[PDB]
Short mmCIF file of C-alpha atoms in Angstrom, two decimals:
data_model
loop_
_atom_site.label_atom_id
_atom_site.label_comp_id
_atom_site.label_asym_id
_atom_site.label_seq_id
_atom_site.Cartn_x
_atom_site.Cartn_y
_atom_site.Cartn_z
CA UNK A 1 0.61 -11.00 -12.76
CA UNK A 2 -0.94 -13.95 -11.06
CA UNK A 3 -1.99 -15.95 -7.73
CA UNK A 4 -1.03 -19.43 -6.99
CA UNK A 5 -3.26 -20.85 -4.77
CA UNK A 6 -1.62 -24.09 -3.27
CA UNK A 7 -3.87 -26.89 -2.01
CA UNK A 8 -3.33 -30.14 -0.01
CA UNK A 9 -4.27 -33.46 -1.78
CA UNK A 10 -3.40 -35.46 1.05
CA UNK A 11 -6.02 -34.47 3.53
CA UNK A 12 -8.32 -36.23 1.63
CA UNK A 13 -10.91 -32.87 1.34
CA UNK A 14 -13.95 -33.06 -0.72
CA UNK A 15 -14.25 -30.53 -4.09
CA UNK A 16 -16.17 -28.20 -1.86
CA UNK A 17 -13.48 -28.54 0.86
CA UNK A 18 -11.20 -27.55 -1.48
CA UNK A 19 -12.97 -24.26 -3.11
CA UNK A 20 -14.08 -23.13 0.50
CA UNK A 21 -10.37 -23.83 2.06
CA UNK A 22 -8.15 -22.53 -1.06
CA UNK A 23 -11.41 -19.51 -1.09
CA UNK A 24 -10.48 -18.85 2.50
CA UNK A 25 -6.41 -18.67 1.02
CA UNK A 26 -7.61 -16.29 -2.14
CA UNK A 27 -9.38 -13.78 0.63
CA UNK A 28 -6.43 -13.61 2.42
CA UNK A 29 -3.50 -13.43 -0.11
CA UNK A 30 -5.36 -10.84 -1.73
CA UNK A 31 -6.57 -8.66 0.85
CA UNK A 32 -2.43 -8.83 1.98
CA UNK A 33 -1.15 -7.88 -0.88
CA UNK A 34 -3.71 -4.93 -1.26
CA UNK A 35 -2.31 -3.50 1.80
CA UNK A 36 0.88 -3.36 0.78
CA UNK A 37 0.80 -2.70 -3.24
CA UNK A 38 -2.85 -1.79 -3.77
CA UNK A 39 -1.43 -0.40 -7.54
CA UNK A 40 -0.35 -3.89 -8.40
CA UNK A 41 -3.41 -5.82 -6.85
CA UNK A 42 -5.62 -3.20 -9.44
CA UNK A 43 -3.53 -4.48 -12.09
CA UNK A 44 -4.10 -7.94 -11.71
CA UNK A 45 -7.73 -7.09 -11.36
CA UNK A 46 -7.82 -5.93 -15.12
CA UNK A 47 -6.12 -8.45 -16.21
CA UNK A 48 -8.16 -11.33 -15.16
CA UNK A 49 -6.86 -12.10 -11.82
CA UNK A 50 -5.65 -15.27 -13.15
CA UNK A 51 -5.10 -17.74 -10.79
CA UNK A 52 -3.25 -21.42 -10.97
CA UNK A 53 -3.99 -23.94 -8.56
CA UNK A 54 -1.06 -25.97 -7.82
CA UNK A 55 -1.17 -29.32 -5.07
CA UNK A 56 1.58 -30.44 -1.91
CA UNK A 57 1.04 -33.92 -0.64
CA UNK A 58 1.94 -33.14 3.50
CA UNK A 59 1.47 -30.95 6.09
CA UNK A 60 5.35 -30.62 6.35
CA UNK A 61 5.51 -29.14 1.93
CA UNK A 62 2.68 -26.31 2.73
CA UNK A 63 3.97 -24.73 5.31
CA UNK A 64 7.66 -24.74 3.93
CA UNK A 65 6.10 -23.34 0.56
CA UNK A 66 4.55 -20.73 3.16
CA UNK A 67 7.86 -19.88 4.99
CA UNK A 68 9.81 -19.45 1.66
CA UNK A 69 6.58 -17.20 0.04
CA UNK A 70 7.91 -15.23 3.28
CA UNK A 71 11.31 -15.22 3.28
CA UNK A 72 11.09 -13.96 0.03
CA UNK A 73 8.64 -10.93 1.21
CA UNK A 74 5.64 -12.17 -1.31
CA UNK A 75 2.30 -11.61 -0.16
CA UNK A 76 0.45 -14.84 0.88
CA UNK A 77 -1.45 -16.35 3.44
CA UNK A 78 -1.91 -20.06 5.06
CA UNK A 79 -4.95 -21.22 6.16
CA UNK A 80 -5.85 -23.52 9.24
CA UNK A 81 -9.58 -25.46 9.19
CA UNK A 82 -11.92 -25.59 11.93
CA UNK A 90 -7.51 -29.01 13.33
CA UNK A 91 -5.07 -28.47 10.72
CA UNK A 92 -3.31 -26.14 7.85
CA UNK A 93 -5.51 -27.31 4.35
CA UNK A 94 -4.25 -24.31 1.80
CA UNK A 95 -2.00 -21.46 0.80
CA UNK A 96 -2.13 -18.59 -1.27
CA UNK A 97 0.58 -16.63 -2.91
CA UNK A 98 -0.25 -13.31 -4.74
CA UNK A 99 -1.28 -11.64 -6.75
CA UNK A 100 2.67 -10.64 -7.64
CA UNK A 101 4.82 -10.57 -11.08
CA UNK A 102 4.35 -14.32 -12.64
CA UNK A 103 8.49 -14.87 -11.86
CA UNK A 104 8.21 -13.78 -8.20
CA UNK A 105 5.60 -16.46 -7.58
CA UNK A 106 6.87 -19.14 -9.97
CA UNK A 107 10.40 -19.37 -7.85
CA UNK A 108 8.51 -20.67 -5.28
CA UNK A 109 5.94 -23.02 -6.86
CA UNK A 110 7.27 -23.46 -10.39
CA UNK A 111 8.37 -27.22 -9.27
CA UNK A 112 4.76 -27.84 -7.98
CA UNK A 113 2.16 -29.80 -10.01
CA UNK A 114 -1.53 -28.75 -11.21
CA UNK A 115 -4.01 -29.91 -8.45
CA UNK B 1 -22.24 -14.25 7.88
CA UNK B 2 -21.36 -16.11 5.27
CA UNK B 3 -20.46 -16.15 1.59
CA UNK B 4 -22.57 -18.85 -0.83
CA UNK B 5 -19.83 -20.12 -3.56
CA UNK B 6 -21.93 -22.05 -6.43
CA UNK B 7 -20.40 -24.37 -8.49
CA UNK B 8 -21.62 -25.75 -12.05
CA UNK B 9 -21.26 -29.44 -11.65
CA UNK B 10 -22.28 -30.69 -15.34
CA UNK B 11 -19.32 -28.75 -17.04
CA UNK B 12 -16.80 -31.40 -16.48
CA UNK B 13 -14.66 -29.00 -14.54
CA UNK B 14 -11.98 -30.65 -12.49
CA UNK B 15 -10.52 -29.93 -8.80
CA UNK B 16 -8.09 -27.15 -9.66
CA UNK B 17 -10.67 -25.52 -12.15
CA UNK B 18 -13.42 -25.12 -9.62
CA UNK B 19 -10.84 -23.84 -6.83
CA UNK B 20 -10.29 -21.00 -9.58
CA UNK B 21 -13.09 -20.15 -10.89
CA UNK B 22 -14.95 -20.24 -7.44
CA UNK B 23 -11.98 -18.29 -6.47
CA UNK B 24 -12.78 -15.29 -8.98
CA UNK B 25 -16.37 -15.43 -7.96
CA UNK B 26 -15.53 -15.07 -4.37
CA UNK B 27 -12.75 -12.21 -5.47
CA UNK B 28 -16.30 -10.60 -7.38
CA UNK B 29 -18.74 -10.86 -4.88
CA UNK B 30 -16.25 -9.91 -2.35
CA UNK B 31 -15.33 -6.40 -4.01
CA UNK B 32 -19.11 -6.33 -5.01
CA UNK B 33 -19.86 -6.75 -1.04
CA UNK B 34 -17.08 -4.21 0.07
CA UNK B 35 -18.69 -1.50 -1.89
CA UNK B 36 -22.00 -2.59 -0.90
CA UNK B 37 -21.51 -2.96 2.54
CA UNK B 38 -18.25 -2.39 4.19
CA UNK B 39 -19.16 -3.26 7.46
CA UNK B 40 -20.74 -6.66 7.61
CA UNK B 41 -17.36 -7.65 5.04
CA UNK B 42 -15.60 -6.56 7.74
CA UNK B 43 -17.64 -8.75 10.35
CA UNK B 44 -17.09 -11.91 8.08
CA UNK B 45 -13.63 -11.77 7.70
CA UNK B 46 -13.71 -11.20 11.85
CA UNK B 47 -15.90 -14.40 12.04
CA UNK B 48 -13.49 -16.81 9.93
CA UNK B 49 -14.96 -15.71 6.35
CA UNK B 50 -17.41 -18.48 6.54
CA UNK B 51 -18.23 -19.85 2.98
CA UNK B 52 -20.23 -22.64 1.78
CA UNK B 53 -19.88 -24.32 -1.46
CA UNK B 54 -23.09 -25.89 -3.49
CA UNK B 55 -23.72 -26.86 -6.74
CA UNK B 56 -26.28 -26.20 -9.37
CA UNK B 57 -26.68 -28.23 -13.20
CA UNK B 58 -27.06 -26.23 -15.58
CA UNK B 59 -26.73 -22.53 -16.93
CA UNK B 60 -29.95 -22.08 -16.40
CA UNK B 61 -29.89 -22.74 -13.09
CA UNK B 62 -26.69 -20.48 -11.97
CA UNK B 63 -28.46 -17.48 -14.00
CA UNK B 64 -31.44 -18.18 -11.84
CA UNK B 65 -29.77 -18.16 -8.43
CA UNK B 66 -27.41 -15.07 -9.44
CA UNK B 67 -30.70 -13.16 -10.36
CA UNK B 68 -32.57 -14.66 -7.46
CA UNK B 69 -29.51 -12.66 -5.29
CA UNK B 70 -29.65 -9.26 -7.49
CA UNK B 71 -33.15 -9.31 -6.83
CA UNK B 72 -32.65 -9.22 -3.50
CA UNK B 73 -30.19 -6.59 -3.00
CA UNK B 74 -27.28 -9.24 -2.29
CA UNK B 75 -23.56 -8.51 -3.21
CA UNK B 76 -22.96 -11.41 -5.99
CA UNK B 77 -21.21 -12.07 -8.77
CA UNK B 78 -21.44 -14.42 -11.58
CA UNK B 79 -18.52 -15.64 -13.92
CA UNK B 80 -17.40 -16.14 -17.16
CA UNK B 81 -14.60 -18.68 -18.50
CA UNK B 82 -12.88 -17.97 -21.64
CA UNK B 83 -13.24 -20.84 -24.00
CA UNK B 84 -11.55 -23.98 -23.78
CA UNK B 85 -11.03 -24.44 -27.12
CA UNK B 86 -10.70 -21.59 -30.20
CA UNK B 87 -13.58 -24.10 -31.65
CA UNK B 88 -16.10 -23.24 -28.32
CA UNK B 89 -17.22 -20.48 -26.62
CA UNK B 90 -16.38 -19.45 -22.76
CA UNK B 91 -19.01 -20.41 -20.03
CA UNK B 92 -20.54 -18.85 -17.05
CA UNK B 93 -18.38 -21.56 -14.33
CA UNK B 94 -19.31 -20.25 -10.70
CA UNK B 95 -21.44 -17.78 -9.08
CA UNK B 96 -20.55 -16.10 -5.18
CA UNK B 97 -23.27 -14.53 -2.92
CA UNK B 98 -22.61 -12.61 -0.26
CA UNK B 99 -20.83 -11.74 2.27
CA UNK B 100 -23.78 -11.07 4.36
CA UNK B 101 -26.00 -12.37 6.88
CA UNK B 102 -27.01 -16.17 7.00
CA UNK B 103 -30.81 -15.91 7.30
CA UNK B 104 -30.69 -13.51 3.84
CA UNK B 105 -28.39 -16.04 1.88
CA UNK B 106 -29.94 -18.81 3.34
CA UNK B 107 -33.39 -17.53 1.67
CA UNK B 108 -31.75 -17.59 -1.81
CA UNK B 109 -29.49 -21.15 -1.70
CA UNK B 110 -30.34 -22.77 1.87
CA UNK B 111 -32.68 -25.56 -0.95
CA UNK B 112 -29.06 -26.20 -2.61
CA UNK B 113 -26.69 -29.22 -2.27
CA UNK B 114 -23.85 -28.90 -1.20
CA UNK B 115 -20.25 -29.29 -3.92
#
């Protein structure tokens, strides 16, 4: 199992920017999918919680890697900084689940 | 409130690796916090799960400022990296204070720059 934490390279945001912002995205994901499969979330837990940060370069790629995270009923979350959206979070869920969504993406 | 994410910053650790690893300290002191303290967790995540990110130099240094937090009754966590190489060992990457109330974190990392 696994978390892909998906950050946006084209805002420009520092390296703390982008712990705090894709931290915010982590928070979230998680505590989403604990409400709705708290057995898997343990899971990934003992395993590591291994998480892969992958980048988008607009606005426009975050939120459609958002939308499809919820089409296909994954947990996730988006987050918005005090204005726009700087990071998503998909998991913790089965590696293939997450990977049809950002498999294409590249490594931040 | 507000959770105190500390980075090393002489490990050579790129973007994407400090998003991760401060991302399983804040996943530690988090679940460290919840256990701790349900209720100002709670408050945080109301409040917009404030977190700061600084950065410390050395080992040495993130040891200090995790024990610094233990020995002040602060939810925290400190982690480890599995090596990067079979021919090196894993190193402590990131440490995560809190969630709890500014003034008390403030006391342990307010002197720190920030990442």
């Amino acid at each position: 199992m696994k978390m892909v934490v998906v950050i946006r390279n084209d805002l420009g945001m520092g390296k703390g920017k982008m712990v705090a912002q894709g931290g915010h995205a982590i928070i979230e994901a998680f505590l989403d999918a604990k409400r709705k499969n708290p057995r898997a979330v343990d899971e990934w837990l003992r395993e590591g919680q291994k998480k892969v940060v992958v980048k988008v370069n607009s606005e426009k790629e975050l939120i459609d890697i958002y939308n499809k995270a919820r089409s296909e009923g994954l947990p996730c979350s988006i987050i918005r900084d005090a204005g726009t959206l700087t990071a998503v979070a998909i998991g913790p869920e089965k590696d293939e689940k997450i990977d049809k969504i950002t498999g294409h993406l590249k490594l931040l």
